[PDB]
Amino acid sequence: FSPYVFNGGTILAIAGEDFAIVASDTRLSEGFSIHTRDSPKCYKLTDKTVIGCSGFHGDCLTLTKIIEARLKMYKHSNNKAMTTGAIAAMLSTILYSRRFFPYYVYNIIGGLDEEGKGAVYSFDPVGSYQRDSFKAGGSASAMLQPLLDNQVGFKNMQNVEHVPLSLDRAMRLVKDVFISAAERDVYTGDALRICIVTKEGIREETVSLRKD
């Protein structure tokens, strides 16, 4: 009896000066079959924080419920909503509590810090986390990450101006990168769910990917 299974899915987060973007694919699969074509992997935590979970789906559901409960408890005890960094540290301790029977979940947190700037935090299944500027996770993370290193980080580029990232360019880049991923990865496709975090709140967009 194996307590795990791989359910696929790709998530992406890009931090801006005044925005954050969290995107995911909506396909849920097991083995060579497709369970559903309409399962998003992004969840709203606060009005300033979104989380992205990929991996084993039962662990994803349980962890989502646990995080929501902990946020409610914190608001009861401390009379304020939790910040993005506090959520990241709490999630790190939650993940390490299962060190000897882990959560098979890959997590990316995206939101705004206390100065209003974009913040992305990436986790491994046991709770090691880091603050980044962009990050990809899931089955097509190895395809997506080099392109973001080139196009957002300007790595290996010679005499190229480091113009700050705009929300328009970031949205176009996300759409293009997921279009490229759905070509080569069998676990990625169906639809793309994009969540944009700004001081005005969270805004959602859906675009179509290829169904084969």
Binding site: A140, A142, M143, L144, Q145, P146, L147, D149, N150, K155, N156, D176, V177, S180, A181, E183, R184
Partner: protein, 204 residues
């Protein structure tokens, strides 16, 4: 995995009347680097090249046996080999060892010796040929190369833009693989010249 023992990445890309083939330069035993000038691209003709990725011993073995067979073919036939014929020859060589496989995957890039039409193909562990009109990759960082190539490749590129595209793809892909890197070498094959370039890369 026995393929990942030495690492290595090879890539071939198609242009307008031109082909490009790029490879990494590291030779190492698992985690230790031994040399930084290991040859993985071999000439099989004036406008025909083969790149091999995988176990370095099989890389050298396959290159030498392939040159044996190609030299005999060109002596008997009095002609230069076409890229598709070389693909078939390599597939035959690899499938003769079906149950004792050579641990190498080849890419072939060339121009037809008469009509000067670009050709690129890839072969897997036992010799199933894959002919493409865009690009082919092989090695330990294949997924990274796939992402870069899908994002950057455009049809009907001139030699300079082809060089820029393949160089960016290889550099950014090997920067994310631990056992690949330590330099990149690129060959641009045209009708009238071969251009070989070494790239400024990360040596960590």
């Amino acid at each position: 995995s026995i393929m990942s023992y030495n690492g290595g990445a090879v890539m071939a890309m198609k242009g307008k009347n031109c082909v490009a083939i790029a490879a990494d330069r590291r030779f190492g035993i698992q985690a230790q680097m031994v040399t930084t000038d290991f040859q993985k691209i071999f000439p099989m003709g004036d406008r025909l090249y083969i790149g091999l990725a995988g176990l370095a011993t099989d890389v050298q073995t396959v290159a030498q046996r392939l040159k044996f067979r190609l030299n005999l073919y060109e002596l008997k036939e009095g002609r230069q080999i076409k890229p598709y014929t070389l693909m078939s020859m390599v597939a035959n060589l690899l499938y003769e060892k079906r149950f004792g496989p050579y641990y190498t995957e080849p890419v072939i890039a060339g121009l037809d010796p008469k009509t000067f039409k670009p050709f690129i193909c890839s072969l897997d562990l036992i010799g199933c040929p894959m002919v493409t009109d865009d690009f082919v990759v092989s090695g330990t960082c294949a997924e990274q190369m796939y992402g870069m190539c899908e994002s950057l490749w455009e049809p009907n590129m001139d030699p300079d833009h082809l060089f820029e595209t393949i160089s960016q793809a290889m550099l950014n892909a090997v920067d994310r693989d631990a056992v690949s890197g330590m330099g990149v070498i690129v060959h641009i094959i045209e009708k009238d010249k071969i251009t070989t370039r070494t790239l400024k890369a990360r040596m960590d």
